[PDB]
Subunit: 58 residues, 2 copies
């Protein structure tokens, strides 16, 4: 099902995570450290859909 | 049995790996990137024994 950003990066590595999410490695690293609740869905076509769940208001 | 340095760091994290090996995180990171063949034995008392296998001469 959905995979946490942290678990994904551990499994697939920082480079692949960054490229799959369209961001720089620093963005991945910072979001993991921040403890943001980010969940990744691996799509059949190899694309990866990342979303964040956070309290409102920010 | 023995665990690779890379797998250990993935499992236990960079901080714990560094402190268990008595080095700075940068030393762990550099050795993983270098692809050095480093193997860790988890001892019963919680100490961790790391050794490197490398061609001779260096």
């Amino acid at each position: 099902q959905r995979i946490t950003l942290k678990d994904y990066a551990m499994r697939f590595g920082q480079t692949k995570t960054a490229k799959d999410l369209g961001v720089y490695p620093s963005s991945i690293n910072q979001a993991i450290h921040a403890g943001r609740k980010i969940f990744l869905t691996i799509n059949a076509d190899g694309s990866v859909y990342a979303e964040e769940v956070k309290p409102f208001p920010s």
